[PDB]
Amino acid sequence: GAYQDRDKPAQIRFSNISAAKAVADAIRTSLGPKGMDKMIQDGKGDVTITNDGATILKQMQVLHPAARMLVELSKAQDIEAGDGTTSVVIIAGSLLDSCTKLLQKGIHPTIISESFQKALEKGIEILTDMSRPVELSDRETLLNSATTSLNSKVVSQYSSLLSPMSVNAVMKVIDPATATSVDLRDIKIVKKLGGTIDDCELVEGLVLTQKVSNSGITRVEKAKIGLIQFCLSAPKTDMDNQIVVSDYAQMDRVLREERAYILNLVKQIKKTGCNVLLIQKSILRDALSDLALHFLNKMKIMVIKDIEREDIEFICKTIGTKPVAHIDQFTADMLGSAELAEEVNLNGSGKLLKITGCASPGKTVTIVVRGSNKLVIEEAERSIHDALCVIRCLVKKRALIAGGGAPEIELALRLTEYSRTLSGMESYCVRAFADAMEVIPSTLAENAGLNPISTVTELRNRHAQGEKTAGINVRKGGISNILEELVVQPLLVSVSALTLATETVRSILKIDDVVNTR
Amino acid sequence: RDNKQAGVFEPTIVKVKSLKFATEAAITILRIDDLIKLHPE
């Protein structure tokens, strides 16, 4: 038979596998209802806590290339799902573990991938079979989906309060009809240090982190809002300009007239009847004048400078009020109106602007985060953000699956026989391929501290007639109907996870060498 | 004694927010299971 001369590739392969397995096993601890968040201190000196693996990995300063792709892999999963970033990598590494298994089993890697290509085709087929179609309007199942995602991170503390906040927010921003893929950036997150995670808030309106510029105007009722872009200061041209002084009456005439210019400026604004002012950054040139504020405050008008050009669409998306860049255009026709708006006072003096109630309901919405630990607030929103993501993922496909590993054991079981069906060495690959999925339930019982092998096999043994509804329970610490435990995840989640892993490891196999570069 | 009789009194919210705030932190710190350090660049 043919003789293999070189082993540099094979060993190089093994190196990657050992790395990957080490990586996944390191992450293995954090997953599921018994997931355990981790912490990193930056070399720059920053400190982070995290339960989501992706953020762990984006924190990971990995030296070895392979997992860097795995790190990259999750980001797509994060850019896809949000959790299972947890789950997906442990799937990825587990594949390579068995992929290692086949390596000293001498099978050429190429056939493995196609076998895996076949292996995935069965699974994606199977997963379609087992999923549960669900229309979007059923709030509770969304809620059921929600906490299922949520009881994976610390935010489980106020999960019961947090989950409704999430879903309601989605309902308010979505169209429950087109079943499209509505963006999340239309949802605003507010990291406000202090408070209680319980005191994290939803705002059906607008909130700006910035602070007022008026000393005296604090709360406004029936506010008529105005957002203005053109600066309110000494008129300065884009091109070079200068007033020349050579005569007597130039002084006051200049002096008086700037205020007059400013005066009419404000005069028109008041003439419009607006009462709350929004001012963007004009860092290229002059901003709002101090003098105008004197007038506007004399005109008793709410005012805010320094509005980010990036937020402006969101805000007019939020407030439904087109901005103004020229006086003539500034007209009450465009003047937005709000039922009430003002600056709240928290943090003792961490004061924040609130705008509740809008005659034009924008689809967008903002979200308030309160809580003691600064890091915990950031991790909370991560959990909140992914909570949104999975819902949007669920918005993508109106089909539902129980969480808690039951799909996986079904799959491997289903793979177990189909592997038996298929002849050739491919069967072993699929035999191994299914054995890869075996890890996740084992991980659960690990993080459940329960006898994994006894449980998961019994989980298989039950599941031989204990189909996807049933599985290992966390709360009771046994194996039960997970559907009856209301622990359910959208189909695509594992789909994306399963799919994404499959392509990558195929790419993993094709590797033969790494060459150090300049 | 009776600090009620002694007048030794404290504002409620002091303990109130306290027990909350400690709860959160204890919630935070307990969940950790692993630290990873980075030497500076």
Coordinates of C-alpha atoms in Angstrom, one line a residue:
Chain A
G1 CA 0.0 0.0 0.0
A2 CA 0.8 3.7 -0.2
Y3 CA 3.4 5.0 2.3
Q4 CA 3.1 8.3 4.2
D5 CA 6.5 10.1 4.3
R6 CA 5.7 13.3 6.3
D7 CA 4.3 13.6 9.8
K8 CA 4.9 17.3 10.3
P9 CA 1.3 18.0 9.2
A10 CA -0.2 15.2 11.3
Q11 CA 1.6 16.5 14.4
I12 CA 0.7 20.0 13.5
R13 CA -2.9 18.9 13.3
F14 CA -2.7 17.3 16.7
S15 CA -1.2 20.5 18.1
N16 CA -4.3 22.4 17.0
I17 CA -6.6 19.7 18.4
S18 CA -4.9 19.8 21.8
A19 CA -5.2 23.5 21.8
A20 CA -8.8 23.5 20.8
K21 CA -9.8 20.9 23.4
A22 CA -7.9 22.8 26.0
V23 CA -9.7 25.9 25.0
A24 CA -13.2 24.4 25.0
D25 CA -12.6 22.5 28.2
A26 CA -11.5 25.8 29.8
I27 CA -14.8 27.4 28.7
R28 CA -16.7 24.2 29.5
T29 CA -17.3 25.3 33.0
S30 CA -19.5 28.2 32.0
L31 CA -22.7 26.9 30.4
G32 CA -26.4 26.5 30.9
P33 CA -28.6 27.0 34.0
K34 CA -25.5 26.0 36.0
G35 CA -23.1 28.2 34.0
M36 CA -20.4 29.9 35.9
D37 CA -19.2 33.4 34.9
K38 CA -15.5 34.1 34.7
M39 CA -13.2 37.1 35.2
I40 CA -10.2 38.6 33.4
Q41 CA -7.8 41.3 34.3
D42 CA -6.4 43.3 31.3
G43 CA -2.7 43.8 30.8
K44 CA -3.6 47.5 30.5
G45 CA -5.2 46.9 33.9
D46 CA -8.9 46.6 33.2
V47 CA -10.9 44.0 35.0
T48 CA -13.9 42.2 33.5
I49 CA -16.5 39.6 34.7
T50 CA -18.3 37.5 32.2
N51 CA -20.5 34.5 31.8
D52 CA -20.9 34.7 28.0
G53 CA -18.0 32.8 26.3
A54 CA -17.8 35.2 23.3
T55 CA -17.0 38.1 25.5
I56 CA -14.6 35.8 27.4
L57 CA -13.0 35.0 24.0
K58 CA -12.9 38.6 22.9
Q59 CA -11.2 39.1 26.2
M60 CA -9.1 36.1 25.5
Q61 CA -5.6 37.1 24.3
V62 CA -5.0 33.8 22.6
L63 CA -1.6 33.1 21.2
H64 CA -2.3 29.9 19.3
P65 CA -4.0 30.6 15.9
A66 CA -6.6 27.8 15.8
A67 CA -8.8 28.9 18.7
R68 CA -8.5 32.4 17.5
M69 CA -10.7 31.2 14.7
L70 CA -12.8 29.5 17.3
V71 CA -12.8 32.9 19.0
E72 CA -13.8 34.4 15.7
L73 CA -16.3 31.5 15.3
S74 CA -18.3 32.5 18.4
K75 CA -18.4 36.2 17.4
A76 CA -20.4 35.1 14.4
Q77 CA -22.5 33.0 16.7
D78 CA -22.8 36.1 18.9
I79 CA -23.5 38.0 15.7
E80 CA -26.0 35.3 15.1
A81 CA -27.4 34.0 18.4
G82 CA -26.0 35.4 21.7
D83 CA -25.9 32.4 23.9
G84 CA -24.7 29.0 22.8
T85 CA -21.6 30.9 22.1
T86 CA -21.2 29.1 25.4
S87 CA -22.5 25.9 23.9
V88 CA -21.1 26.1 20.3
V89 CA -17.5 26.1 21.2
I90 CA -17.7 23.1 23.4
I91 CA -19.4 21.4 20.5
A92 CA -16.5 22.6 18.3
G93 CA -13.7 21.3 20.4
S94 CA -15.6 18.1 21.1
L95 CA -15.7 17.4 17.4
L96 CA -12.0 17.8 17.2
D97 CA -11.6 15.5 20.1
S98 CA -13.3 12.8 18.1
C99 CA -11.5 14.2 15.1
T100 CA -8.4 13.5 17.0
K101 CA -9.8 10.0 17.7
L102 CA -10.0 9.3 14.0
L103 CA -6.6 10.6 13.3
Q104 CA -4.6 7.8 14.9
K105 CA -7.4 5.8 13.4
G106 CA -5.7 6.6 10.2
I107 CA -8.6 7.9 8.2
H108 CA -7.8 10.7 5.8
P109 CA -9.2 14.0 7.0
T110 CA -10.9 14.8 3.7
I111 CA -13.5 12.0 3.9
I112 CA -14.2 13.1 7.4
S113 CA -15.5 16.4 6.4
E114 CA -17.8 15.0 3.7
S115 CA -18.9 12.4 6.2
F116 CA -19.5 15.4 8.5
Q117 CA -21.1 17.2 5.6
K118 CA -23.5 14.2 5.5
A119 CA -23.5 14.1 9.3
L120 CA -24.8 17.7 9.4
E121 CA -27.4 17.1 6.7
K122 CA -29.1 14.5 8.9
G123 CA -29.0 16.6 11.9
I124 CA -30.3 19.8 10.4
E125 CA -33.0 17.6 8.9
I126 CA -33.7 16.0 12.3
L127 CA -33.7 19.4 14.1
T128 CA -36.3 20.6 11.6
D129 CA -38.4 17.6 12.5
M130 CA -38.3 18.0 16.2
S131 CA -38.8 21.8 16.4
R132 CA -42.1 23.4 17.4
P133 CA -43.7 26.1 15.1
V134 CA -45.0 29.0 17.2
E135 CA -46.5 32.3 16.0
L136 CA -44.9 35.4 17.4
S137 CA -47.9 36.7 19.2
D138 CA -47.8 34.2 22.1
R139 CA -46.2 36.5 24.7
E140 CA -45.6 33.8 27.3
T141 CA -43.7 31.4 25.1
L142 CA -41.5 34.3 24.1
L143 CA -41.3 34.8 27.8
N144 CA -40.7 31.1 28.2
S145 CA -38.0 31.4 25.6
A146 CA -36.7 34.5 27.4
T147 CA -36.0 33.2 30.9
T148 CA -34.6 30.1 29.3
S149 CA -32.0 32.3 27.8
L150 CA -31.8 34.4 30.9
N151 CA -31.3 31.6 33.5
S152 CA -27.8 31.2 32.1
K153 CA -26.1 34.3 33.6
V154 CA -26.1 36.3 36.8
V155 CA -29.1 38.4 35.7
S156 CA -31.0 35.3 36.9
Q157 CA -31.1 37.3 40.1
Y158 CA -33.9 39.5 38.8
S159 CA -34.8 37.3 35.8
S160 CA -38.5 37.2 36.7
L161 CA -38.5 41.0 36.4
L162 CA -36.0 41.2 33.6
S163 CA -37.6 38.9 31.2
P164 CA -40.9 40.8 30.7
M165 CA -38.9 44.0 30.3
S166 CA -37.1 42.4 27.4
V167 CA -40.0 40.9 25.6
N168 CA -42.3 43.9 26.0
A169 CA -39.5 46.1 24.5
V170 CA -39.2 43.8 21.5
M171 CA -43.0 43.9 21.0
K172 CA -42.9 47.7 21.0
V173 CA -40.1 48.0 18.5
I174 CA -41.1 45.1 16.1
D175 CA -43.8 44.8 13.6
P176 CA -45.6 41.6 14.8
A177 CA -46.6 41.2 11.1
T178 CA -43.7 41.2 8.6
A179 CA -41.7 38.6 10.6
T180 CA -38.6 40.4 9.4
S181 CA -35.2 40.7 11.1
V182 CA -35.6 44.0 13.0
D183 CA -32.4 45.6 14.2
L184 CA -31.5 45.8 17.9
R185 CA -29.6 49.1 17.7
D186 CA -33.0 50.7 17.5
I187 CA -33.1 49.7 21.2
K188 CA -31.0 51.9 23.5
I189 CA -29.1 50.6 26.5
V190 CA -28.4 52.9 29.4
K191 CA -25.4 51.9 31.6
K192 CA -26.1 54.0 34.7
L193 CA -23.8 53.2 37.6
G194 CA -25.4 52.6 40.9
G195 CA -28.9 51.7 41.7
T196 CA -30.2 48.1 41.9
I197 CA -30.4 45.6 39.1
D198 CA -34.0 45.4 40.3
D199 CA -34.2 49.2 39.7
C200 CA -33.1 48.7 36.0
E201 CA -35.8 50.4 34.0
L202 CA -37.6 50.4 30.7
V203 CA -38.2 53.8 29.1
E204 CA -41.1 54.1 26.7
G205 CA -39.6 57.4 25.5
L206 CA -36.2 59.1 25.3
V207 CA -33.4 59.4 27.8
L208 CA -30.1 61.2 27.3
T209 CA -27.0 60.7 29.4
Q210 CA -26.0 64.3 29.0
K211 CA -27.0 67.1 31.3
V212 CA -28.9 70.3 30.9
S213 CA -27.4 73.7 30.4
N214 CA -30.2 75.8 32.0
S215 CA -29.9 76.7 35.7
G216 CA -33.5 77.0 36.8
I217 CA -35.4 74.9 34.3
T218 CA -35.6 71.3 35.6
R219 CA -39.0 69.8 34.8
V220 CA -41.2 70.5 31.8
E221 CA -44.8 69.6 31.2
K222 CA -46.5 69.2 27.8
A223 CA -43.1 69.9 26.3
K224 CA -42.8 71.0 22.7
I225 CA -39.4 69.7 21.7
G226 CA -36.9 71.2 19.3
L227 CA -33.7 69.7 17.9
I228 CA -31.4 72.3 16.2
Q229 CA -28.2 71.6 14.3
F230 CA -27.0 75.1 13.2
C231 CA -25.0 76.7 15.9
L232 CA -26.2 79.6 18.0
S233 CA -23.2 81.9 18.5
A234 CA -21.3 84.7 16.7
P235 CA -21.9 84.0 13.0
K236 CA -18.7 82.4 11.7
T237 CA -18.4 81.5 8.0
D238 CA -17.0 78.3 6.7
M239 CA -14.5 80.4 4.9
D240 CA -12.3 83.0 6.4
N241 CA -14.1 86.1 7.6
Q242 CA -13.3 89.0 9.9
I243 CA -14.9 92.2 11.0
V244 CA -12.6 95.1 10.5
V245 CA -12.5 98.0 12.9
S246 CA -11.3 101.4 11.6
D247 CA -14.0 103.8 12.8
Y248 CA -15.9 105.0 15.8
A249 CA -19.5 103.6 15.7
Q250 CA -18.2 100.2 14.7
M251 CA -17.8 99.2 18.3
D252 CA -21.4 99.2 19.7
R253 CA -22.9 98.6 16.3
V254 CA -21.0 95.4 16.1
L255 CA -21.5 95.0 19.8
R256 CA -25.3 95.6 19.8
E257 CA -25.9 93.8 16.5
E258 CA -24.6 90.4 17.5
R259 CA -27.1 90.3 20.3
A260 CA -29.8 91.5 18.0
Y261 CA -28.9 88.7 15.6
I262 CA -28.9 86.4 18.6
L263 CA -32.1 88.0 19.8
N264 CA -34.0 87.4 16.6
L265 CA -32.6 83.9 16.5
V266 CA -34.2 83.1 19.9
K267 CA -37.1 85.4 19.0
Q268 CA -38.0 83.1 16.1
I269 CA -37.5 80.0 18.2
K270 CA -40.0 81.3 20.8
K271 CA -42.1 82.5 18.0
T272 CA -42.3 78.9 16.9
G273 CA -43.5 78.0 20.4
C274 CA -41.0 75.2 21.1
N275 CA -39.9 74.9 24.7
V276 CA -37.1 72.2 24.8
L277 CA -33.9 72.7 22.9
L278 CA -31.6 70.0 21.5
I279 CA -28.2 71.0 20.3
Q280 CA -25.6 68.8 18.6
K281 CA -21.9 69.0 18.7
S282 CA -20.4 71.6 16.3
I283 CA -16.8 70.9 17.3
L284 CA -15.6 72.2 14.0
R285 CA -16.9 75.7 14.9
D286 CA -18.7 77.7 17.6
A287 CA -21.5 76.0 19.6
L288 CA -24.5 77.6 21.2
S289 CA -23.6 81.0 22.6
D290 CA -23.5 81.7 26.3
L291 CA -25.5 84.8 25.5
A292 CA -28.3 82.9 23.7
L293 CA -28.6 80.7 26.7
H294 CA -29.0 83.9 28.7
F295 CA -31.8 84.8 26.4
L296 CA -33.3 81.3 26.1
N297 CA -33.2 81.1 29.9
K298 CA -34.6 84.6 29.8
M299 CA -37.1 83.1 27.4
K300 CA -37.4 80.2 29.8
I301 CA -36.6 77.4 27.3
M302 CA -35.3 74.0 28.1
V303 CA -32.0 73.5 26.4
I304 CA -29.4 70.7 25.8
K305 CA -26.1 71.1 23.9
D306 CA -23.7 68.5 22.7
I307 CA -25.8 65.9 21.0
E308 CA -24.0 63.2 19.2
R309 CA -24.3 63.1 15.4
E310 CA -24.6 59.3 15.7
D311 CA -27.6 59.3 18.0
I312 CA -29.5 62.0 16.0
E313 CA -31.3 59.5 13.8
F314 CA -32.3 57.3 16.7
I315 CA -33.6 60.3 18.6
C316 CA -35.7 61.6 15.7
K317 CA -36.6 57.9 15.3
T318 CA -37.4 58.0 19.0
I319 CA -39.1 61.5 19.2
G320 CA -40.3 61.6 15.7
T321 CA -39.0 65.1 15.2
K322 CA -37.0 66.1 12.2
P323 CA -34.1 68.4 13.1
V324 CA -33.4 71.9 11.8
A325 CA -30.3 73.4 10.2
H326 CA -31.8 76.8 9.0
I327 CA -34.0 79.3 10.7
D328 CA -36.6 79.5 7.9
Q329 CA -37.0 75.7 8.1
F330 CA -37.5 75.8 11.8
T331 CA -41.2 75.7 12.1
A332 CA -43.9 74.4 14.5
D333 CA -44.9 72.0 11.7
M334 CA -41.7 70.1 12.5
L335 CA -41.8 71.0 16.2
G336 CA -42.1 67.8 18.1
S337 CA -44.3 67.6 21.2
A338 CA -44.0 65.4 24.3
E339 CA -46.4 64.9 27.2
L340 CA -43.6 65.4 29.7
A341 CA -39.8 65.4 29.8
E342 CA -37.3 66.3 32.4
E343 CA -34.0 65.3 34.1
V344 CA -34.2 62.7 36.8
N345 CA -32.0 62.8 39.9
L346 CA -30.3 59.5 40.9
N347 CA -26.9 58.4 42.1
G348 CA -27.4 61.1 44.8
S349 CA -26.3 63.5 42.0
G350 CA -25.9 61.3 39.0
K351 CA -28.7 63.2 37.2
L352 CA -30.3 62.0 34.0
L353 CA -32.6 63.3 31.3
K354 CA -36.0 61.7 30.8
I355 CA -38.6 62.1 28.0
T356 CA -41.7 60.1 28.6
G357 CA -44.7 60.1 26.3
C358 CA -44.6 61.1 22.6
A359 CA -47.5 62.1 20.4
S360 CA -45.6 60.3 17.6
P361 CA -44.7 56.8 18.8
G362 CA -41.4 55.8 17.3
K363 CA -40.7 52.1 17.1
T364 CA -37.4 52.5 18.9
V365 CA -37.0 52.3 22.7
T366 CA -34.4 52.7 25.4
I367 CA -33.4 50.5 28.4
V368 CA -32.2 51.6 31.8
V369 CA -29.6 49.7 33.8
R370 CA -29.2 50.2 37.5
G371 CA -27.3 48.1 40.0
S372 CA -24.3 48.3 42.3
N373 CA -21.3 46.7 40.6
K374 CA -20.1 48.6 37.6
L375 CA -18.9 45.3 36.0
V376 CA -22.1 43.6 37.0
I377 CA -24.1 46.3 35.1
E378 CA -22.0 45.6 32.0
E379 CA -22.5 41.9 32.3
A380 CA -26.2 42.4 32.9
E381 CA -26.7 44.3 29.6
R382 CA -24.7 41.7 27.8
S383 CA -27.2 39.2 29.2
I384 CA -30.0 41.7 28.3
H385 CA -28.6 42.2 24.8
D386 CA -28.4 38.5 24.0
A387 CA -31.8 38.2 25.5
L388 CA -32.9 40.6 22.8
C389 CA -30.9 38.7 20.2
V390 CA -32.4 35.3 20.8
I391 CA -35.8 36.9 20.5
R392 CA -34.9 38.4 17.2
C393 CA -33.5 35.1 16.3
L394 CA -36.8 33.7 17.3
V395 CA -38.4 36.5 15.2
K396 CA -36.4 35.1 12.3
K397 CA -38.0 31.6 12.6
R398 CA -41.4 30.9 14.3
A399 CA -40.2 27.5 15.5
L400 CA -39.3 26.4 19.0
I401 CA -37.1 23.8 20.7
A402 CA -36.6 22.9 24.3
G403 CA -33.3 23.9 25.7
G404 CA -31.4 21.9 28.3
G405 CA -29.5 19.6 25.9
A406 CA -32.4 17.4 24.9
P407 CA -32.1 18.1 21.1
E408 CA -28.4 17.0 21.3
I409 CA -29.0 13.6 22.9
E410 CA -31.9 13.0 20.5
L411 CA -29.6 14.0 17.6
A412 CA -26.7 11.7 18.7
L413 CA -29.2 9.0 19.4
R414 CA -30.8 9.6 16.0
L415 CA -27.3 9.8 14.6
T416 CA -26.4 6.6 16.4
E417 CA -28.7 4.5 14.4
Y418 CA -28.3 6.3 11.1
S419 CA -24.5 5.9 11.6
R420 CA -25.3 2.2 12.1
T421 CA -27.3 2.4 8.8
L422 CA -24.4 3.9 6.9
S423 CA -21.6 1.6 6.0
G424 CA -18.0 2.4 5.3
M425 CA -15.5 4.2 7.6
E426 CA -17.9 7.2 7.4
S427 CA -20.0 5.4 10.0
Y428 CA -17.3 5.7 12.6
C429 CA -16.9 9.3 11.8
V430 CA -20.6 9.8 12.2
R431 CA -20.3 7.4 15.1
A432 CA -17.7 9.7 16.5
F433 CA -19.7 12.7 15.2
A434 CA -22.6 11.7 17.3
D435 CA -20.3 11.0 20.2
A436 CA -19.2 14.6 20.0
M437 CA -22.8 15.9 20.8
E438 CA -22.6 13.5 23.8
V439 CA -20.5 16.1 25.6
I440 CA -23.0 18.8 26.2
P441 CA -25.4 16.9 28.4
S442 CA -22.4 15.5 30.2
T443 CA -21.3 19.1 30.8
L444 CA -24.7 19.9 32.2
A445 CA -24.5 17.1 34.8
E446 CA -21.0 18.2 35.5
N447 CA -22.2 21.8 36.2
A448 CA -25.1 20.0 37.9
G449 CA -22.6 18.0 39.8
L450 CA -24.7 14.9 39.0
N451 CA -23.4 11.6 37.8
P452 CA -23.2 12.5 34.1
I453 CA -22.7 9.1 32.6
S454 CA -25.4 7.4 34.6
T455 CA -27.8 10.4 33.9
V456 CA -27.0 11.0 30.2
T457 CA -27.2 7.3 29.3
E458 CA -30.4 7.1 31.2
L459 CA -31.3 10.2 29.4
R460 CA -30.6 8.3 26.2
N461 CA -32.3 5.2 27.6
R462 CA -35.4 7.2 28.4
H463 CA -35.1 9.2 25.2
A464 CA -35.2 6.0 23.2
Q465 CA -38.8 6.6 24.0
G466 CA -38.4 9.8 26.0
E467 CA -38.3 12.2 23.0
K468 CA -37.2 15.8 22.9
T469 CA -39.7 17.0 25.5
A470 CA -37.9 15.1 28.3
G471 CA -34.5 15.7 29.6
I472 CA -32.2 16.4 32.6
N473 CA -33.8 18.9 35.1
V474 CA -31.6 21.4 36.9
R475 CA -34.1 22.5 39.6
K476 CA -35.1 19.0 40.7
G477 CA -31.6 17.6 39.8
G478 CA -33.0 14.7 37.7
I479 CA -34.3 13.9 34.2
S480 CA -37.8 15.2 33.4
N481 CA -39.9 16.9 30.7
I482 CA -38.0 20.0 29.9
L483 CA -41.0 21.4 28.0
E484 CA -42.9 21.0 31.3
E485 CA -40.0 22.8 32.8
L486 CA -40.6 25.6 30.3
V487 CA -36.9 25.6 29.2
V488 CA -37.1 26.3 25.5
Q489 CA -34.8 27.8 22.8
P490 CA -35.4 28.7 19.2
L491 CA -34.5 26.2 16.5
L492 CA -31.9 28.3 14.7
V493 CA -29.8 28.7 17.8
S494 CA -28.4 25.2 17.8
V495 CA -28.9 25.2 14.0
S496 CA -26.5 28.1 13.6
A497 CA -24.3 26.5 16.2
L498 CA -24.3 23.1 14.5
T499 CA -23.9 24.6 11.1
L500 CA -21.2 27.1 12.0
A501 CA -19.1 24.5 13.8
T502 CA -19.4 22.1 10.8
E503 CA -17.9 24.4 8.3
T504 CA -15.1 25.5 10.6
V505 CA -13.8 22.0 11.5
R506 CA -13.9 21.1 7.8
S507 CA -11.6 24.1 7.4
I508 CA -9.8 22.9 10.4
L509 CA -9.0 19.6 8.7
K510 CA -7.7 21.1 5.5
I511 CA -4.9 22.7 7.5
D512 CA -1.6 21.0 7.2
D513 CA 1.0 23.6 8.3
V514 CA 1.6 27.1 9.7
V515 CA 4.5 29.2 8.5
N516 CA 5.9 31.9 10.7
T517 CA 6.0 35.2 8.8
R518 CA 7.8 38.5 8.7
Chain B
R1 CA -30.6 48.1 76.9
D2 CA -33.5 49.7 75.0
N3 CA -31.7 51.8 72.4
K4 CA -35.3 52.9 71.8
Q5 CA -35.2 54.3 75.3
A6 CA -31.6 55.3 74.8
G7 CA -32.4 57.2 71.6
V8 CA -29.8 55.2 69.7
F9 CA -31.6 55.2 66.3
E10 CA -30.5 54.9 62.8
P11 CA -32.3 55.7 59.5
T12 CA -34.0 52.7 58.0
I13 CA -32.7 53.1 54.4
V14 CA -29.2 52.8 55.8
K15 CA -29.7 49.1 56.6
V16 CA -32.2 48.9 53.8
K17 CA -29.9 49.7 50.9
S18 CA -27.0 48.1 52.7
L19 CA -28.5 44.6 52.8
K20 CA -29.4 45.1 49.2
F21 CA -26.0 46.4 48.1
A22 CA -24.1 43.7 50.0
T23 CA -26.5 41.1 48.5
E24 CA -25.6 42.2 44.9
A25 CA -21.9 42.3 45.6
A26 CA -22.0 38.9 47.3
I27 CA -24.0 37.7 44.4
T28 CA -21.2 39.1 42.1
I29 CA -18.2 37.8 44.0
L30 CA -19.5 34.4 44.7
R31 CA -20.3 33.5 41.1
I32 CA -16.6 33.8 40.2
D33 CA -14.7 30.6 39.8
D34 CA -11.6 31.6 37.9
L35 CA -9.4 34.6 37.3
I36 CA -7.1 35.2 34.3
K37 CA -4.3 37.8 34.5
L38 CA -2.6 39.7 31.7
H39 CA 0.9 41.1 32.0
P40 CA 1.0 44.6 30.5
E41 CA 2.3 45.2 26.9

